[PDB]
């Protein structure tokens, strides 16, 4: 299509345009955070290791569903659970229109024999051309004039996986700009809105156990499933549609015997495939050229 999901800015709130960090690598949970080098894939043939939350890619616990009306029949694009913005992990790169690259995500070597990972990704293009500072947003409302080091804004705390993502009602901004090469007719630069444009997405759909199921929409993401016969890993060729700055989100799909929600709307499961010691599994993200 793709769908566009339009959010209304509220601070405090779920759609408060919070800041994400390109270095944080540790899983969710208590304890000393682990920061690695910033995950800049510019130039390609780069690889970084990090942990992703158990159900970070698709989790009814987010308490919000979106709908994809570009799907026929329309009932098949309904009630899509979101992912968690901050228990997935973010990276970026600068690239050129036409760049043919390969994204790979697989279990980290330290966890290569531990079942749990089914990595997925979302790739966005940010026409603004670099990190987007927006005063008055959740983490930029104390007089900051710039983003903190190695950080960038994204729309909200729960994320859509197959849509253009738009935030409107932002604190008015007189310097929301894009570089000269950007068609601001097609990609507007509004004083009160910004859009993260969908480029691609996908997830490892190869199950560890044939009898089990993935915590995943029955039909909405049929075009997104990647099967290569290897559970815990995917590879996807991508040709960049635009010159500029890209934002990459990676998160996990959980495999279970069954899942539901409880009275509070929290995920319940039985027979999870989760052999790793923490609340997130370590994966290695690689972008190669070609
Ligand atoms: Ca696979």
TrEMBL record:
The chain holds residues 251 to 540 of 540 of the full protein. One of its GO terms (cellular component) is extracellular region. The lineage of its organism: Bacteria, Pseudomonadati, Pseudomonadota, Gammaproteobacteria, Methylococcales. It comes from the Bacteria. Residues 30-260 form the Copper(I)-binding protein CorA domain. The gene is mopE. This is Surface-associated protein.
